[PDB]
Amino acid sequence: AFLGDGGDVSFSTRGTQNWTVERLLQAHRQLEERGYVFVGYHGTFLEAAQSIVFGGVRARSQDLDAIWRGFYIAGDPALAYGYAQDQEPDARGRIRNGALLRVYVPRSSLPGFYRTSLTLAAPEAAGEVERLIGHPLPLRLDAITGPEEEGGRLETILGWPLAERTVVIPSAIPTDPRNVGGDLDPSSIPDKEQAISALPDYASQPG
Amino acid sequence: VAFTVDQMRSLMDKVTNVRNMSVIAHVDHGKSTLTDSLVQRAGIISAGITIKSTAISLYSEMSDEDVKEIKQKTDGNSFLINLIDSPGHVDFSSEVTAALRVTDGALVVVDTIEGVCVQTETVLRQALGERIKPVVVINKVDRALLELQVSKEDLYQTFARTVESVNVIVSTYADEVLGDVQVYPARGTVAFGSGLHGWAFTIRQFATRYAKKFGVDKAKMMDRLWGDSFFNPKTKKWTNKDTDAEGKPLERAFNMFILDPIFRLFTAIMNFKKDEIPVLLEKLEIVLKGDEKDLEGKALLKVVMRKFLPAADALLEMIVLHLPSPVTAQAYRAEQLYEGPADDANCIAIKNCDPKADLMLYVSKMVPTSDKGRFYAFGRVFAGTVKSGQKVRIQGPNYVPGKKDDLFIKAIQRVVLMMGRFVEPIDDCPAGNIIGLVGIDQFLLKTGTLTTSETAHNMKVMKFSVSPVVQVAVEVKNANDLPKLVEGLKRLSKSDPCVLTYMSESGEHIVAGTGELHLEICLQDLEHDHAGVPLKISPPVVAYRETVESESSQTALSKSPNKHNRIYLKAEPIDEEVSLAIENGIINPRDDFKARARIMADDYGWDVTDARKIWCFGPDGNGPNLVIDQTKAVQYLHEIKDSVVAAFQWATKEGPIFGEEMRSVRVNILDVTLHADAIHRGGGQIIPTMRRATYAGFLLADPKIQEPVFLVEIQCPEQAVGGIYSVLNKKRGQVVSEEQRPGTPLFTVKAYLPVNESFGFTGELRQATGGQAFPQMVFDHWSTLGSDPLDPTSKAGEIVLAARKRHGMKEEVPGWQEYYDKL
Ligand SMILES: NC(=O)c1ccc[n+]([C@@H]2O[C@H](COP(=O)([O-])OP(=O)(O)OC[C@H]3O[C@@H](n4cnc5c(N)ncnc54)[C@H](O)[C@@H]3O)[C@@H](O)[C@H]2O)c1
Fold it and tell me: How many distinct structural domains can be found in chain A?
């Protein structure tokens, strides 16, 4: 268990249950102590978070070119915040808020983390990425970080093999049920969480 | 007795022998106890679809000589008695009037010791205002003998004072158009007995028995059996002075021939005098059977008194012989029950109880049934005959012969007898009888008037409203009982048309009522019946509305998460007239868009252009809120309509101020930019966009909140009227009018009372008027607070902040910037 001590953690529209800031600091500490490192956030809907936190990140089909398949996370929680919501309304047409998740990997996987200035998910970057990771896409036991779009914010792609080795825990950053679609207000980010949200230094050159 | 549908019909066409009456009694007076004695005696049973008991049918048979005493037209020796159920407390005033309005007679139950209580007294003057003839029964006589052990003269004087206080109320409030309606024991309009032990008698009952032993017509015999009449035992002479020649006291007739025999049995049995009881029982001819010959104490006394003077027979006697039939009563209650001309073709048909004229059926309430979630209309035919399949004009509250508002020309699926808990279909039903109807619950909320005449006005309407102005949050104490509560709420909302159970966005289970008390009883039934599970109920909360005061300071802009879609809009207030029109069905969502626009344009000054660009109403797709399409040449605009509408439904259900429904809010979509590929204009993208833009526009249109306001009608004696104003002047109440009843000293004060000031109102009004006040409030209008909801200190802001915290929201109300596009 990597969720720390407390009640049963569940995901709701009212917010994550039994997940204070203090419990996060504990779980984060216990994670570092076991050789794990924080690499970013992952915004998604309630049922998904549940599956990830309690079942683990597992590979699945996704709408994109096969060479870019993998788990998608972002260093800046504001970016991942935009995906923390239902992507499709229910029968009546409700679109409820989601949850922000924190992704941790074994430090042993850090040698596989690289970065690039090029925009990802584009054929114009595939070559450079394949150069850095030292093999043809898709990503495997490695990860790539680069602008989600031209001039946009950074994103990180965890090759599924590496993504299935993550340990994900809830974030103390709450989604807003009365403002679904709104942008993350930086003042809603617990100063204590911001302190533990520093990202590792990624390689700009291949191994 | 078991009756066939043929027998009932044959019994229902003889209206002259029907007794429409209710029982006016305090619950702690054995109201249900005397009622039980009646149903176990005269209760009619039929020789699948069950309903909530609302009325009971009783059968009573009498002799040819008895029928000759009835001072009203009669036909035959059979009598149908409709015992219409009454509320369990005065507080349920609205339905207290409902029962009384469909009745003609009243059995007023009064206590022996305590006499007439404040409640029964208040209900009585209401019944008298409805022109209901009362007959009295002094219950709890058992207590006077066993506990108090009073003498025969003490008990008599006790009855004399009790009857005295009753006629004080009667002669005072009973309208002079009915003649002397006062009750006199000597005239068989007053009975005495104990509901508990199940015995009761009238002066007429003992008069009949001694009538032979004195070779005397019971007329002058029952005349003697009360008041100052004395039968000197030594001289065997009847006298009018309470002393003999030597100045010795004489026992009065009532104490001698009526009370003595009863006092004898009470003493013989309760003292276990085994040798007296047999002798005492024989001369009264009370024969015990097998098991009964061994009984002792109260066990024996109960049997002996039940066989000596059966309770139901004394009551049935007064009911049949002294209570007005539909024919006799409708003659003087018609003008009062008709909201139109007195010489109208229909009003006249009501006075004559004419079964041939246009139908005039009254619907007093809607009764829950086992046939799905449908309700069965309950009422009384005041004119014409109701038939199965017959097409009738269902005229609701707002209905007026002029307009076609609140009118539904539908057909009666089936007409049925309300046999207490069961249903019995019949072909038709002549005027004068109580009946139930099938297939009207979707046209009549609770009350209304059925008519077959295109020129007949509604009958005296009883003001009601489904508007949930108060609500609470239900929550199981044990997380495993969740399914039991979920089904409990689904059950609760079905037992009452005016109860609302829904789920807020947060997922909370909400129960909303029409008033403090109405919501109180519902939370009880839920935690004891529908669910039966320990519940955690939050304090009661008043329901508010969010609205705008002007047009948005500027255009509201908001883009989708994918940054490819944008919605430009602007909010503006909607005229109260219009919002009222929408709430009143005039401006209808399911109405043709062209026909509807003509109305809004001609009758409300709307640009017919905009009125045809209405995309939807809200919330629930019919509220007093509108989305108007004012875009120009937007490609694929229609392919997002379903989403935009959906968003508006949620945005109007819970506003940006503090989660409360919107009211009178017009949203004008000014412009839209969409991605070319429909893969990026799905619900997931548009819904939030529209939702947020609406919030931004709302917050820019000078936000305001509206509070619900009651209209309270209070009946109160002149003396205690001062206590009414005393309470209203600290509840922000505003007096509308103060009318006085012509003859009586009864006043009818009407005033507006903010719902958030009505909590415990009846309790305070009770004390201030000594219990003489008869409250009756219904939702009237919404009132916009002047104060700024965005200001935490202002009266509006105070409410807002308190609510926001209570909901766990950010204490401060969001600025339009939060929902506006983050540029
Ligand atoms: N989601 C983010 O936090 C994030 C961060 C940066 C960029 N992006 C952008 O979003 C696009 C993909 O969005 P996405 O990743 O949310 O959708 P996706 O199609 O890549 O993944 C599908 C969804 O399945 C859900 N899920 C449920 N159980 C899971 C499990 N056990 N393991 C893994 N996933 C599970 C995830 O929440 C995820 O949202 C990318 O192309 C990228 O450009 C997203």
Answer: 1
To test the pocket of ligand 1, the residue of A47, A72, A73, A79 to mutate (highest count of ligand atoms within 8 Å of its CB) is: A72
B326-462 CATH pick, 2.30.30.280, 2.40.30.10, 2.10.260.10, 2.70.98.10 = 2.40.30.10
Give the integer Cα–Cα distance in Å for B564 and B611: 30
The closest of B332, B366, B329 to B98, measured between CA atoms, is B366
Q: What residue has token string 């047409």?
A: A93
CATH superfamily of domain region B463-543: Elongation Factor G (Translational Gtpase), domain 3 (3.30.70.870)
Query: Quick check: is A193 catalytic?
Result: no
The matching CATH number, chosen from 3.40.718.10, 3.40.50.1370, 3.30.70.3270, 3.40.50.300, for B1-202+310-325 is 3.40.50.300
Tell me whether B615 touches chain A (CB under 8 Å): no
> What is the A164 CA–ligand 1 centroid distance (Å)?
13
What is the per-residue DSSP string for B394-455? EE-TT--SSS-TTEEEEE-SEEEEEETTEEEEESEE-TTSEEEEES-TTT-SS-EEEES-TT
Point out the residue among A87, A92, A183 whose CB comes nearest to the CB of B684.
A87
How many angstroms from the chain centroid is the CA of residue B625? 32
Q: CA B382, CA B428: separation in Å to the nearest integer?
A: 14
B470, amino acid identity? V
| Domain ranges within chain B, ordered by starting residue | 1-202+310-325, 203-309, 326-462, 463-543, 549-702, 703-823
Beta bridge partners of B630: none
Cβ-Cβ contacts under 8 Å for B232 (sequence gap 6 or more):
B238, B239, B244, B250
CA distance A11 to A96: 12
Read off the CATH number of the domain in which A116 is found: 3.90.175.10
Query: Which 529-558 residues of chain B touch chain A by CB within 8 A?
Result: 558
Angle, vertex CA B554, rays to CA B552 and CA B555, nearest 5: 95
Report whether B140 belongs to an annotated binding site: yes
CB atoms within 10 A of CB B550: 12
**Binding residue per annotation — B476?**
no
Find the farthest-apart pair of alpha carbons in chain B and give their distance in angstroms, rounded. Answer: 120
Cα distances from B287 to residues B199, B303, B306, in angstroms, run 16, 10, 11
Q: Which residues of B289-321 are buried (b: 16+ CB within 10 A; e: fewer)?
A: eeeeeebeeeebbbbbbebbbbbbbbbbbbbbb
Residue B365, strand partner residues = B378
Nearest CA to ligand 1 atom 35: A48
| Axis crossing angle, helix B516-525 with helix B482-495, rounded to the nearest 10 | 130
Residues 6+ positions from A133 with CB-CB distance below 8 Å: A112, A114, A139, A140, A142, A144, A206
Compute the distance from residue A38 Cα to the ligand 1 centre, in Å: 18
Strands (DSSP E) contained in B276-400 are 360-368, 375-381, 386-387, 391-395
- Same fold: B203-309 with B549-702: no
Q: Which residues of chain B have a CB within 8 Å of the CB of A94? A: 505, 650
The answer to whether the Cβ–Cβ distance between A95 and B684 falls below 8 Å is yes
- The β-bridge partners of B45 are B2
Question: What residue numbers bound the domain in which A106 lies?
Answer: 1-207
